[PDB]
Symmetry: C2
């Protein structure tokens, strides 16, 4: 009757295997979300040994056995590539969810009915998540720097947060054309040693990774006409390589970045005339230096010409913490802007590089939705006491659906209390009571002193595409995994 | 500290053994409550075989081992003294109220919390019972019948409930003086063979269990002057025996009932004149026949008189079921009141004699207190959705407790319906929603239909003392229990 891999589990047998798998990797992930947790150390196979707190990776490495348990990576995985933030959230409440869906299924529910609850309480939840929404519109600066600070919390520096959420709002407020499309690609993040957390600056242009070629070429130009060649100023020795260099100084460059190198004796001519030049320079390089400086990007070094060519307000080669790089400031029309990040080690620079990228992301969310929620746990307790009262509206089995799915929304505000060594059942009361009466806004779980607070007036708050995706893609993922009743296993 | 007798437990060690205590005893007698509940077969160390439903006697005969188990007979035992039904009630949801409690001293709250709850929610629950009280008067007759039929429910004739309700009303609106005290002892319940369930009749008088001794007496007397001797017709032969019987004739007596005997030359003398007389008749049927008749109860024979003596339209010796009995009807001033009971055998007889004694008790309760309150399960449901709401009120520890005691109050009307088979999710939704909107009087649990019911309008309702006593007795005896925190045992 079957063959090829076959040991077979319906009903109880089934329950066990899909609950244990999903419970598992929740426990995994429970104590990594927000201010109150904690670090994990992986090791595979290659005996290789790897500290991390962040949920995707964490289930990536760990070669899994449970196939059912494999379909749950899948649901943290599609929350990182998309939005980013909330890996954690989508998933954890995807295992909790399921525990609670066990108590029932042991009431012999018709798995039928329990889904007929958590669907109509997904849906309603949409109508809830949308109103607690405390609308503040798109380019208001106050709030931009409260969505940006929350882009920077639980992090190796949330400290900076006020200087990492400023030159960020200036750098996305400066990129986006026709209010309501929201571009990342544009904001590069360079990371150099020396400073503090607050000496991060926003050069209206492009800061690349580039020496001066020829030691010839003046180490700084004033009002410079930067060229872009993506393609060859290599030909083989004497003549060819002279005709390429005397045609750059024919058109109008002082400044040249070529994605395709330089020889010796051709930088000697470049520096003969007062032309500086930057070798090997990356095509990442190229496009940024194009919108910085103002450039239309060419093919070769042989089309290089002042007209497809830029305008730039200072251009020095600056050695910065024992490495040379090329700056390109005062930029006329930056689409797209680089933010210099001063910094600790490469590790706190990188992070203030990621505490902008996911800041520009998340504000490219308050362009397209200029909603703002709910200071982490906040909107949960609100959804709580609404959707409880929603339940007294359904009737039948779907009663017992929607009640359970509210009371498991208290999962996340709970653990972030517990992790915090707090009395849960006091605060819960504190926050719930203060949310029905203040609003969206006001109604928080602050870690610190331990009591309900204005994540708003702090503000401490996060974008709205974050909360939205994290809950939907999670919620419907764990009702798939709900619903397979029959496991015939095998490799 | 230690030995003889003792092992010790604190912690989860104690906790378990009392709980086990607890749940078990209860598991036993949950099944027996209500429309929908079954028998149980007891056997003692004697060998004796014993089949009963009633939860006092169940727990009384099985030789119980756990001391803590021993605390818990005394909480169904006191409920039977009082009211009667609630045995069952007082002690199951005693056991249930434990199991919940569990979930919390596991918890880890401080048993001081639990209890903090359960006492404000017992208070409150006082305020609630008070209200779901549906209004009406002392000797109203629809509500007399209702409270009568619900003293006749889930017993061997709930049968003739209608006919058993109406002769009891009659019998207790007969007895009371100054409306607001209902006396018991004065409604005698005489069992005999042959009738049906509905042919049960109120002779405003007394019907005893003596025949006419001496064959010479008067097989029927018209307007008779009954005489009440507690004292010996008993003297040593010839003379002393006749001027005691000549003394009865000298007053007025047609009729006579002596506590004590009659020697055979004596009843030959009282039959000589037309005197009837009744042999070995107890103390019992002595201050019965005196409320019937209108007598005042004297010492000896001698004593006998016109006076001290009664008045009674009809006194005939009627074979009934082929047992001789003496009837004493059309009594002029009856304070007290035999109610002849015909059915099927002995059992159906005696049963309508129990189904009137509880019916004269609870009667006696709606005299003194003017309230009526629904079975099966109006007042449960209504406390549920009120005491839920009353939680949101409270704040802290005490939240938790009062939600767990309102949930507790549902399991009786859940089982209730299970017993049936009786998906209880739907109905409970049914009866709850109906109650918040109609009232006290019309939100039922009628087994038969399957549906929410006007207990009132149908008939089906209990008194007030029954549900008041029930409640409080049970709730603070399981709190108690839940206190003990240290067992040292035994020998």
């Amino acid at each position: 009757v079957l063959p090829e891999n076959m040991k077979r589990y319906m009903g109880r047998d089934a329950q066990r295997m899909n609950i244990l798998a999903g419970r598992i990797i929740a426990e995994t992930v429970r104590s990594t979300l927000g201010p109150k947790g904690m670090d994990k150390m992986l090791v595979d196979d290659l005996g290789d040994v790897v500290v991390t707190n962040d949920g995707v990776t964490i289930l990536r490495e760990m070669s899994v056995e449970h196939p059912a348990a494999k379909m749950l990576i899948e649901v943290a995985k599609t929350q990182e590539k998309e939005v980013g933030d909330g890996t954690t959230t989508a998933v954890v409440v995807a295992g909790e969810l399921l525990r609670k869906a066990e108590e029932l299924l042991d009431q012999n529910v018709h798995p039928t009915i329990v889904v007929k609850g958590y669907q109509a309480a997904a849906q309603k939840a949409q109508e809830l998540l949308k109103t607690i929404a405390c609308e503040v519109g798109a380019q208001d600066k106050e709030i931009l720097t409260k969505i940006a600070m929350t882009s920077i919390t639980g992090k190796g520096a949330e400290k900076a947060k006020e200087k990492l959420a400023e030159i960020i709002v200036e750098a996305v407020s400066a990129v986006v054309d026709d209010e309501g499309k929201v571009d990342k690609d544009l904001i590069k993040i360079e990371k150099k040693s020396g400073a503090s957390i607050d000496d991060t600056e926003l050069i209206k242009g492009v800061l690349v990774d580039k020496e001066r070629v020829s030691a010839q070429m003046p180490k700084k130009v004033t009002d410079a006409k930067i060229a872009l060649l993506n393609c060859a100023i290599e030909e083989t020795a004497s003549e060819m390589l002279k005709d390429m260099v005397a045609e750059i100084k024919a058109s109008g460059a002082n400044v040249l970045f070529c994605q395709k190198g330089i020889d010796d004796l051709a930088q000697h001519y470049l520096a003969k005339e007062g032309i500086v030049a930057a070798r090997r320079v990356k095509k990442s390089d190229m496009e940024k230096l194009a919108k910085a400086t103002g450039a239309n990007v060419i093919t070769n070094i042989k089309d290089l010409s002042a007209q497809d060519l830029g305008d730039a307000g200072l251009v020095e080669e600056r050695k910065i913490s024992g490495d040379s790089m090329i700056f390109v400031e005062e930029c006329k029309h930056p689409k797209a802007v680089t933010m210099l990040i001063r910094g600790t080690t490469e590790h706190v620079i990188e992070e203030v590089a990621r505490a902008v990228d996911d800041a520009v992301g998340v504000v490219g969310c308050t362009i397209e939705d200029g909603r703002i929620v709910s200071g982490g746990g906040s909107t949960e307790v609100e959804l709580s006491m609404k959707l409880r009262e929603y339940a007294e509206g359904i009737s039948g089995r779907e009663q017992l659906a929607v009640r359970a799915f509210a009371d498991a929304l208290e999962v996340i505000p709970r653990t972030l209390a517990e992790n915090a060594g707090l009395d849960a059942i006091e605060i819960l009361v504190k926050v719930r009571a203060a949310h029905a009466s203040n609003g969206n806004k006001c109604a928080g779980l602050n870690v610190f002193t331990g009591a309900v607070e204005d994540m708003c007036e702090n503000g401490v708050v996060e974008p709205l595409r974050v909360k939205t995706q994290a809950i939907q893609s999670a919620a419907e993922s764990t009702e798939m995994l709900l619903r397979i009743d029959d496991v015939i296993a095998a490799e």
